[PDB]
Design a protein around this ligand. Structure first.
Ligand code: PIT
Ligand code: PIT
Ligand code: ZN
Ligand code: ZN
Lengths: 180, 176
């Protein structure tokens, strides 16, 4: 089952010139409580809030998190928007006003029925170290580095239960135990 | 209301030094049919397949797609994986083998109950020209550039029904 390498490549086309400056700018998740979300993504994972927007008829706010240096963030409202939404690899967290105060409300993380979305993933230079810190800080784990067969790979959860892969690019080649 | 700006910022902490080289490397979506998915992300959206991984015991494959020049992919296999999984803003598409032939299976896009995930988003130089190309290619639209209040912002759907935003950053800088 599954495609061969060749069959997969036969389904691929070269990038049309019209697409040549496109970039993958954002991944959007719904959040129940932006206070807890901002504290997790900034304090625990070290991202930076680069932009926020509010839509009062709609009754929602948008928050833009990214691994960016806060010094590079423009001060002028208009320029900041242009800068923020032209960064690669942002996380857009949507808050529907009111969710934080409903005890039962929760978003679905995509990993139980009905499945779809699986996770976001953060490349780190040392999974083991980063995960000792997450433990120290009380983060919830789906999978700790040495649980199951894929070693030196972890999954944690944000305050909504969305899964975050924690990986080391250099270990991905050799995930499984080897020579042994 | 929700939070003021000042409040929101009050909830943010400075980066712990240990997190300084962290990067948002991937967003994983599961896909029914990798053939149609690969065709959509490469031909319609102009991404590149940078890594394919197969796990026959577990019966799934992973396809890493990114806006990268195909001439920068390493030739050697361990180097290519390290490079691919060190790129920012990749899309990981997971194919559980057999879904492509299953008439009743489909994945949920996160935008009907139960909701969670909403969309990925592509920044483009010009939303109107991008979407006119997308329409000529038969792409299915959830929101056309000028439908509703937010003009020059569009939403299309991939073969599984995931929503993809099409935005122009230089022009939200002339909107509220
Ligand atoms: O606990 C779990 C559950 C699951 O359903 C999948 C995995 C592994 C996925 C994976 C494997 C290799 C990668 O390079 C990658 O980014 C993701 C781990
Ligand atoms: O069809 C949908 C569903 C949804 O849940 C949200 C939106 C759009 C809101 C939005 C508005 C401005 C932005 O810059 C952005 O990235 C997203 C569109
Ligand atoms: Zn969005
Ligand atoms: Zn992953």
């Amino acid at each position: 089952g599954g495609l061969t390498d060749e069959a997969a490549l036969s389904c691929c086309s070269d990038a049309d010139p019209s697409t040549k400056d496109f970039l993958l700018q954002q991944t959007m998740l719904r959040v129940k409580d932006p206070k807890k979300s901002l504290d997790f993504y900034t304090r625990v994972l070290g991202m930076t809030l680069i932009q926020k927007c509010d839509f009062p008829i709609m009754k929602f706010s948008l928050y833009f998190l990214a691994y960016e240096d806060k010094n590079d963030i423009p001060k002028e409202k208009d320029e900041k928007i242009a800068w923020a939404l032209s960064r690669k690899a942002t996380l857009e967290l949507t808050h529907n006003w009111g969710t934080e105060d409903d005890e039962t409300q929760s978003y679905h993380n995509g990993n139980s029925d009905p499945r779809g979305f699986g996770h976001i993933g953060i490349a780190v230079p040392d999974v083991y170290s980063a995960c000792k810190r997450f433990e120290e800080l009380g983060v919830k784990f789906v999978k700790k580095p040495d649980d199951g067969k894929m070693k030196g790979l972890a999954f944690i959860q944000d305050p909504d239960g969305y899964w975050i892969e924690i990986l080391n690019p250099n270990k991905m080649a050799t995930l499984m135990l080897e020579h042994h």
